[PDB]
Amino acid sequence: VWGHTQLNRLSFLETVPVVPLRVSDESSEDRPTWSLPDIENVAITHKKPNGLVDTLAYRSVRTCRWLFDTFSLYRFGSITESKVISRCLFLETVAGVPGMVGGMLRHLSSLRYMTRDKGWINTLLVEAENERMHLMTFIELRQPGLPLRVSIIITQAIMYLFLLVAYVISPRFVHRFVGYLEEEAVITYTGVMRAIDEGRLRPTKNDVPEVARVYWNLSKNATFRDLINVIRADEAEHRVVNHTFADMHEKRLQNSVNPFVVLK
Amino acid sequence: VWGHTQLNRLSFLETVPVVPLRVSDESSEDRPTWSLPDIENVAITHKKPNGLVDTLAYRSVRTCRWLFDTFSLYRFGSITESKVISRCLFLETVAGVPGMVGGMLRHLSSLRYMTRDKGWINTLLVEAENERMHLMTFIELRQPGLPLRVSIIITQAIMYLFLLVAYVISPRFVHRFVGYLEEEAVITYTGVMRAIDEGRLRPTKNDVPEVARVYWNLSKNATFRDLINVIRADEAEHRVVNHTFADMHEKRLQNSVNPFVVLK
Numbered sequence: 090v091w092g093h094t095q096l097n098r099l100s101f102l103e104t105v106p107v108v109p110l111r112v113s114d115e116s117s118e119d120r121p122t123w124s125l126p127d128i129e130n131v132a133i134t135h136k137k138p139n140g141l142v143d144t145l146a147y148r149s150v151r152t153c154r155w156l157f158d159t160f161s162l163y164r165f166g167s168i169t170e171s172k173v174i175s176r177c178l179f180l181e182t183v184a185g186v187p188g189m190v191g192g193m194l195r196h197l198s199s200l201r202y203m204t205r206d207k208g209w210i211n212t213l214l215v216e217a218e219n220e221r222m223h224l225m226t227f228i229e230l231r232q233p234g235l236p237l238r239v240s241i242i243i244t245q246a247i248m249y250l251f252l253l254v255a256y257v258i259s260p261r262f263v264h265r266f267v268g269y270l271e272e273e274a275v276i277t278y279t280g281v282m283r284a285i286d287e288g289r290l291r292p293t294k295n296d297v298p299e300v301a302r303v304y305w306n307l308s309k310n311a312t313f314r315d316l317i318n319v320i321r322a323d324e325a326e327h328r329v330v331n332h333t334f335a336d337m338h339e340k341r342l343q344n345s346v347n348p349f350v351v352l353k
Numbered sequence: 354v355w356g357h358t359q360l361n362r363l364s365f366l367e368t369v370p371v372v373p374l375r376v377s378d379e380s381s382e383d384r385p386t387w388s389l390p391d392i393e394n395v396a397i398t399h400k401k402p403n404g405l406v407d408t409l410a411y412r413s414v415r416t417c418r419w420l421f422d423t424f425s426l427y428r429f430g431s432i433t434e435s436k437v438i439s440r441c442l443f444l445e446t447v448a449g450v451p452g453m454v455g456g457m458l459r460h461l462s463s464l465r466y467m468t469r470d471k472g473w474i475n476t477l478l479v480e481a482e483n484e485r486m487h488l489m490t491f492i493e494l495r496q497p498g499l500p501l502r503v504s505i506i507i508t509q510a511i512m513y514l515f516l517l518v519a520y521v522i523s524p525r526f527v528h529r530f531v532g533y534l535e536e537e538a539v540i541t542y543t544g545v546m547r548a549i550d551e552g553r554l555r556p557t558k559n560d561v562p563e564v565a566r567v568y569w570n571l572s573k574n575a576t577f578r579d580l581i582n583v584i585r586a587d588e589a590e591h592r593v594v595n596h597t598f599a600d601m602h603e604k605r606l607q608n609s610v611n612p613f614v615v616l617k
């Protein structure tokens with residue numbers, strides 16, 4: 090029904106009163122579609138670093154873990170559900186930026202040079218969205234306090250800036266860095282899952298939010314375990330896809346067709 | 354078959370030299386679908402400015418039309434296909450930016466305030482992608498000179514910066530500034546279609562580029578006019594959508610469900 094008669098109306102401000110809040114509309118239509126007993130078998134991998142650069146990405150990813158563990162007192166206390174979420178929550182605020190700047194920089198090159206991109210730009214932009222939906226999911230499980238609100242904001246500053254220039258200077262470094270982060274992402278979500286299983290953590294969000302049901306297409310019966318596990322598969326996708334974009338950069342392949350447009 | 358076994362592999366660098374370059378993958382799959390006899394009737398509109406803001410937007414967008422027409426010898430020549438393609442090519446290198454800075458900002462706000470976006474983001478993201486396809490098409494009907502190829506980059510720098518700080522200060526301003534740009538894009542692309550029809554322009558690439566032919570889903574018999582015709586629809590879509598957004602801004606509805614999610 091989207092025709093020239095709609096196209097020719099000056100504005101549509103007067104229709105915002107009558108248009109529902111739909112949870113399907115929070116995301117773009119490009120949703121993951123994992124099946125659960127498969128992705129159960131996601132596993133902690135570690136790509137060896139080649140050069141200085143891959144190493145620098147590592148040491149700095151490792152240093153970021155160290156910091157964010159000591160200061161988040163993940164290390165001293167007991168694995169609560171409240172410090173698991175409160176942790177990811179913070180962490181998805183940053184997870185949404187290296188997708189987005191990567192897309193937005195590639196897109197500017199592809200405009201200015203006037204050149205085909207071969208479906209990088211969209212894969213990166215959805216990683217950015219995919220992570221944003223982790224954050225839209227975790228926010229439903231736990232609204233954080235003024236402290237964390239403000240630590241997210243200063244941090245976004247630091248990061249949006251670091252990622253913008255680190256990506257100008259070295260897309261290889263960023264894709265390699267995000268790659269290294271996502272190994273940790275996957276450890277943190279398989280550790281969590283190990284914990285639910287063993288019984289060392291008994292989660293009271295066995296309601297899975299409406300956003301997260303339609304986005305990941307799960308049953309209404311989907312447990313908290315399930316939700317970690319699909320997100321743990323999203324994070325494995327990112328682990329390879331950016332370590333793939335890393336290597337492509339390594340071998341001057343940073344303008345080849347993105348192999349994953351095929352491999353969907 | 355995108356399951357754990359793939360997700361568990363360190364790279365896919367191997368595959369890169371055996372995966373094809375298919376013109377579909379250049380875009381996301383969130384493609385336009387018009388039919389030509391309907392969007393034949395797309396009109397030239399003009400929204401009233403309310404504020405000193407909407408005014409400013411309008412006067413900036415007119416001064417830009419003036420400049421561009423004057424520095425592009427459009428005012429003093431027999432309209433060629435060359436200068437039509439040349440003007441439209443340059444321009445999509447600036448159309449491709451607002452959607453991208455708009456989208457990313459809304460994204461970064463959603464991440465740091467941990468709040469819903471309600472599907473503005475992905476709209477501004479396919480706003481920008483669509484534009485960039487306009488440019489991928491025009492690149493193929495005419496590869497530009499060095500002197501334009503330069504101008505393009507110095508332009509991007511100015512504009513990327515401008516829109517980034519405009520969009521922080523008043524997206525209402527920018528979304529208007531686009532709204533009033535797309536009014537002038539429709540004017541032109543109609544004029545062009547008139548000029549084909551009145552016989553005064555004899556287009557020589559009625560081979561419509563593969564990129565486009567898939568993107569806009571046209572026949573193999575699709576003419577140049579036919580392409581102009583759709584591109585113009587897209588441009589009039591962006592005209593309402595941005596004015597709507599600048600209208601929503603104006604009434605403090607920059608958090609309301611993007612009306613157009615539904616109208617899709």
Ligand SMILES: CCCCc1cc(=O)oc2c(O)c(O)ccc12
Pocket residue numbers: 150153154155157176177180181184220223270271273274277278324
């Ligand atoms: C500095 C490494 C942080 C690891 C991490 C833990 C987590 O709980 O969730 C993450 C996560 O959701 C990511 O996307 C990336 C990294 C993590």
Ligand SMILES: CCCCc1cc(=O)oc2c(O)c(O)ccc12
Pocket residue numbers: 414417418421440441444445448534535537538541542588
């Ligand atoms: C700065 C005014 C430009 C108007 C305009 C003319 C044109 O020939 O093509 C356009 C175009 O392709 C757009 O996407 C936006 C604006 C124009």
Ligand SMILES: [Fe+3]
Pocket residue numbers: 180181184220223274324
């Ligand atoms: Fe994550």
Ligand SMILES: [Fe+3]
Pocket residue numbers: 184220271274324327
């Ligand atoms: Fe991540």
Ligand SMILES: [Fe+3]
Pocket residue numbers: 444445448484487538588
């Ligand atoms: Fe355009």
Ligand SMILES: [Fe+3]
Pocket residue numbers: 448484535538588591
């Ligand atoms: Fe445009």
